[PDB]
Design an enzyme around this catalytic site. Sequence first.
Site, mmCIF file in Angstrom:
data_model
loop_
_atom_site.group_PDB
_atom_site.id
_atom_site.type_symbol
_atom_site.label_atom_id
_atom_site.label_comp_id
_atom_site.label_asym_id
_atom_site.label_seq_id
_atom_site.Cartn_x
_atom_site.Cartn_y
_atom_site.Cartn_z
ATOM 1 N N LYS A 85 63.150 64.415 -92.808
ATOM 2 C CA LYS A 85 63.070 63.655 -94.228
ATOM 3 C C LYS A 85 63.618 62.393 -94.444
ATOM 4 C CE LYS A 85 63.198 68.115 -97.145
ATOM 5 N NZ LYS A 85 63.100 68.933 -96.106
ATOM 6 N N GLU A 107 63.071 64.998 -107.004
ATOM 7 C CA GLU A 107 63.336 66.303 -107.282
ATOM 8 C C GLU A 107 63.675 67.027 -106.182
ATOM 9 O OE1 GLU A 107 59.944 66.602 -105.591
ATOM 10 O OE2 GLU A 107 59.262 66.948 -107.688
ATOM 11 N N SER A 373 63.253 70.331 -86.771
ATOM 12 C CA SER A 373 63.169 69.270 -88.119
ATOM 13 C C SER A 373 64.665 68.875 -88.647
ATOM 14 C CB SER A 373 62.308 70.052 -89.036
ATOM 15 O OG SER A 373 62.428 71.631 -89.124
#
EC number: 4.2.1.20
Lengths: 393, 393
Positions: A85, A107, A373
Amino acid sequence: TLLNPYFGEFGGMYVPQILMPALRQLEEAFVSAQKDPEFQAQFNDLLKNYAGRPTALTKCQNITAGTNTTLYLKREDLLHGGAHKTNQVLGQALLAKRMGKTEIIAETGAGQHGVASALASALLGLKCRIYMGAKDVERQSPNVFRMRLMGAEVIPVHSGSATLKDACNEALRDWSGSYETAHYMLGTAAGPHPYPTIVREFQRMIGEETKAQILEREGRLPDAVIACVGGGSNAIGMFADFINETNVGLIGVEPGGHGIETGEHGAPLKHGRVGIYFGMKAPMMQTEQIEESYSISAGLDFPSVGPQHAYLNSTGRADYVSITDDEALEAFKTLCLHEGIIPALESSHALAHALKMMRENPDKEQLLVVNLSGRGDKDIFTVHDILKARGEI
Amino acid sequence: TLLNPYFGEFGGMYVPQILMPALRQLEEAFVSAQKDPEFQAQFNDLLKNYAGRPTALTKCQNITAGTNTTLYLKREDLLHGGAHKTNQVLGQALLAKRMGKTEIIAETGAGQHGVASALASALLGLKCRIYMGAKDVERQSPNVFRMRLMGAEVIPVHSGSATLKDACNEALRDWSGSYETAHYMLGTAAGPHPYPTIVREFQRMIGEETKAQILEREGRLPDAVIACVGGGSNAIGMFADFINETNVGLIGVEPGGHGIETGEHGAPLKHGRVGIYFGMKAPMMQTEQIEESYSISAGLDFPSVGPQHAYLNSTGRADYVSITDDEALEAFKTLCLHEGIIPALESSHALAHALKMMRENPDKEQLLVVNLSGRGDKDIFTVHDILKARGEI
Ligand SMILES: *Cc1c(COP(=O)(O)O)cnc(C)c1O
Ligand SMILES: *Cc1c(COP(=O)(O)O)cnc(C)c1O
């Protein structure tokens, strides 16, 4: 609108008229920046010296011992922040500064994307506000604390069911009237166009680095590249640079939940139906209305999928499987015990599917690459609770 | 004994006769491996593809805004595992396999070195056993769980005061009779020779990479390199390659505790007296007997210092300051809010001292480099508790 908002019959911009300008204007700014190498110059400076790119490629010999599979892990777990991310987040932060925006709206469900946004905003100095369902805000003290330490404002959402969907909806209402000075940092490769595209482009370097590294280390592309799929950002980011290398596998692992046949899961791709959700048109888990998803993993707890994944799925370019709470937990424990790496419970689904391909064909000659990830430190509490409830301490 | 076991009047091998063979034999194996490039080849393969070396160098512009200081952080926080300990641990794991050992013995206080050892052992496949004071075992569930997930055996020590000293002592008694098949992975640049040397050599790449990166990015060496000092492994690892560049600052930050003038601290270097401890002869905090140390930071909670640091201190080649619980906490919060990075509370002491040098001389033209030894995720609970007790939620 410059780019095409669809991938096959999927994607789109199903959002109130008030958002078209904000959406169209984002797209332009994005194109203009894709083409500006001064931007690319800054982006890469950030990815290289702040986030730590490029991320390693690890050969997991112990795990494949006694078989003919060669397994590599693209170490997104080693990126600053602990997960992939951080890539897309640093990208949009820049994009936003480029558009002269002074604020970030985001969010988060468990706070993984929240912490990421807070971090990007701290760096690029933007006033960050993160919506979060009240139920989750209670369940996620640490990440809420992290976001606060990073100077971000966490706004608990109490409407609807006080969870991710609601935090998500409120975020968009916010942006509807504040897009003039606030950029909406969407957490994944989904939602209305141009997000699925922007997120793919801001994550595609993981697939890029992988191919390069795999050549330098194996002299040949992998038989397959496996990655977990929630909204699809880390999977697409790995897939991208391989769509073209046609003889390369593109496997996407969705959460099996308590069993793809219990309803308690999150594999809308292979077990749902197309409808419009989060502003996009894609497969999803509906009742008759939208329904509920589930996974030991919160990151993979998404009732839909990104438009490009639904597309690559229908063309058959990419394959999408399912791995369950237990197979994931098993993988999680396996990587821990043999490689000394704690995988994020999300990535555990991909590592799980890989192990499945090897254990079922030990003699098969295969070169696999799983996209790890994120790191799993933020999941030991959960794993520990399950193992304790299951009565295995 | 091949190498010289002392650094000035410091260091040595003050350990029972039963340990001389094990100690001498380790030293040899080490020398033989320093010189074997096949070893160096493997070590670097591990550091590069498993741990993620080299680690970034980050320019913290936001933090120095409005001054003439240029601040860089050597990102050890981005190493696999979260801290610099992973370097030396992968080194000794290899060394041990080289000596044909099949087991690792280690001791940990808060489990940072414990998790590190467990990890190295999982990778290099060695049966790892980690001694830990019972009091700490209770205070550190997560890391104890991590070590267990990584297949290591945590042996709680209940003798003496059931803490680090005791876990440490028991580890050595273990090794005394098992060095034939078990290598004792000491957690820092201290203890009897050859450990202070081996750990310096297995950490020195951080200083190496720093210099290289600093040239490529600034065209000149830094005015100073600052690093926190517990036993001294991450500080020496950064110092090493700079001892020679004489016009480069070598600052070492010890924990100020509740105030270097309350007894509740851990800066034996500048406020203690030479004595023999942990098998080495160095400065320490004595009563009249050994005494107690303290810090908001457990990693920096050491009552002594490595022999080479005591040495570099007496020659005056390196300077050693002190930073307190609050100045560290302040730094910790500062880095969080402006750079989007959560520093480990240990490193916070070094970042703290840097900030001190800048705030007190905003006009001074200085190029500083702090060694960010680890990430601070494992410290939010603590910081949160303090901030809550202090009544600031
Ligand atoms: C958030 C997250 C995901 C799920 O998101 P995608 O949008 O499918 O990448 C996957 N892995 C990790 C570790 C994450 O934190
Ligand atoms: C353990 C640790 C230290 C203290 O050890 P040294 O032997 O002085 O390096 C410093 N920083 C971090 C983050 C650590 O985990």
